[PDB]
């Protein structure tokens, strides 16, 4: 297969404006949301039809209970951080955990936390330790590293359980996740040449410009890979034309193992 990933995010907000959830948790496979929970619904719900179709109600019910507990835990941790920081007002706490199964068969796993959108604690599952970014994090690092069993548990989950979940979801969603929609690519002038691709899946694509067979990445404007809304993606790249000397410009696109070259006459 291509490379795939599973990740779960949590967001906690300490003093949210009216209506907005104190806690949200969303899972993803690759770019696809698969699960959602928040402090208003208090229910874990599918966000992909192939998840709803393959996981029985006992799954959603069980994780709904775990998520209600994780919500409270996140509130306690954020309250503690905001004390240590001696911060007033509304602040955010975030978690991300997940794993990748790479094309070549190797795996990665990661777990990290953020306070106000900046790295706070980063787990190293090989050295079994937490990297702290400041002294509030250092105090938390000490507490977490005193619990050696919990570090081992997180290493096992990242390396074994997470990969098993990902493989299970990849099969559930294989019609979506493992399909290929090749890009439609065109060049136009707007003075710079724009190389535009659309209609492609998966979103991973490489577009660049070459000039007389050489790649000058410092003078290329790369556009973002953006969702088109129908499940496919679009992207672009531009390079500025030299009006005093002719050059052979060509756009190069790589997608899912196929290379394309559009030479501009």
């Amino acid at each position, epitope marked *: 297969m291509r490379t795939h990933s599973l990740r779960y995010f949590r967001l906690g907000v300490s003093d949210p404006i009216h209506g907005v959830p104190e806690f949200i948790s969303v899972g993803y496979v690759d770019s696809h949301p698969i699960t959602t929970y928040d402090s208003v619904t*208090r229910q874990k719900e599918p966000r992909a039809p192939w998840m709803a179709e393959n996981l029985a109600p006992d*799954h959603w*019910e*069980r*994780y709904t*209970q*775990l998520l*209600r*507990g*994780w*919500q*409270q*835990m996140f509130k306690v941790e954020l309250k503690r951080l905001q004390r240590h920081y001696n911060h007033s007002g509304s602040h955010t706490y975030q978690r991300m955990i997940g794993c990748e199964l790479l094309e070549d068969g190797s795996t990665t796993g990661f777990l990290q936390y953020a306070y106000d959108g900046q790295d706070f604690l980063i787990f190293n599952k090989d050295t079994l330790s937490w990297l702290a970014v400041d002294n509030v994090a250092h105090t938390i690092k000490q507490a977490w590293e005193a*619990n050696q*069993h*919990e570090l*081992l*548990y997180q*290493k*096992n*989950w990242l390396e*074994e*359980e997470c990969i*098993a*979940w990902l493989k299970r979801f990849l099969e559930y969603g294989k019609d979506t996740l493992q399909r290929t929609e090749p890009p439609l690519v065109r060049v136009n002038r707007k003075t710079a040449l724009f190389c535009k691709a659309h209609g492609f899946y998966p979103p991973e694509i490489y577009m660049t410009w070459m000039k007389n067979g050489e790649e000058i990445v410092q003078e290329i404007d790369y556009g973002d890979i953006l969702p088109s809304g129908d499940g496919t993606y679009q992207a672009w790249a531009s390079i500025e034309l030299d009006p005093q000397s002719s050059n052979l410009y060509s756009c190069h696109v790589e997608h899912s193992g196929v290379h394309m070259v559009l030479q501009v006459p």
Partner: antibody, heavy 109, light 116 residues
Framework: GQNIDQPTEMTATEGAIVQINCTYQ??????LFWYQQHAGEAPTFLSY??LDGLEEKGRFSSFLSRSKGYSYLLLKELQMKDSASYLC??????????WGAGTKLIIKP | NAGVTQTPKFQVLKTGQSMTLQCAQD?????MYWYRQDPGMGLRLIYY???????DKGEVPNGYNVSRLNKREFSLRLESAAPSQTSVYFC??????????????FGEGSRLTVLE
């Protein structure tokens, strides 16, 4: 389904060594616990394993092999106070604890 | 520093009688559990409470209900006792949810015999 197995009873001599086995077949694995339960009393936590290998705590050690789905609790220099039931339990992929039926350890003075 | 306090230690009931078992922990734990222990089998979860404010069924909920009254207390109700409910009942608690390496802390147990 999921299941966990350990012998019903073991008998050993005071001063000796006993190895209490626990094998499990589960849907996922999030760690293996051993508890001690003296007759008529509450179970109390003894050990937790989740990666492979042997961990020591006094006269008790606990081993885990994830690929073989097996653990043992090892008691050295047995004393009469070690007479008790020993319960294995495994957390599955959804953090449900699956409990073995327990091994009653009888010690001969 | 009491740990998990459950009552009563012993109780005889007639079929159809009602009974509540009490359990409190003073460890500031978030999760609480009611188990039954019977000869020849592993502990079986009746109901649990992952956090204050929520409860859910375990493996053997039929004939029981629970109340997570507050963070400390988790009571077990037998509205109409049946002989099959003759058992030893254990309340337990853990720091956080069932999820992770945290162990269980058990109460001293409640022995119920239900008789026709």
């Amino acid at each position: 389904g999921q299941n966990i197995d350990q012998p019903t009873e073991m008998t050993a001599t005071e001063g000796a060594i006993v190895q209490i086995n626990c094998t499990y077949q589960t849907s996922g694995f999030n760690g293996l616990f051993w508890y001690q339960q003296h007759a008529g009393e509450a179970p109390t936590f003894l050990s937790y394993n989740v990666l492979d290998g042997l961990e020591e705590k006094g006269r008790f050690s606990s081993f885990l092999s994830r690929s073989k789905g097996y653990s043992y609790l090892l008691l050295k220099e047995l004393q009469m106070k070690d007479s008790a039931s020993y319960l294995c339990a495994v957390k599955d992929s959804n953090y449900q604890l699956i409990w073995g039926a327990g091994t009653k350890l009888i010690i001969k003075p | 520093n009491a740990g998990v306090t459950q009552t009563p230690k012993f109780q005889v009931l007639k079929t159809g009688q009602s009974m509540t078992l009490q359990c409190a922990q003073d460890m500031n734990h978030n999760s609480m559990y009611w188990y039954r222990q019977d000869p020849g089998m592993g502990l079986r979860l009746i109901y649990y409470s992952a956090s204050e404010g929520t409860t859910d069924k375990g493996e053997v909920p039929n004939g029981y209900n629970v109340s997570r009254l507050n963070k400390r207390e988790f009571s077990l109700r037998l509205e109409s006792a049946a002989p099959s409910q003759t058992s030893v009942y254990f309340c337990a608690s853990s720091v956080w949810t069932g999820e992770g390496s945290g162990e269980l802390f058990f109460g001293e147990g409640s022995r119920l015999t239900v008789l026709e």
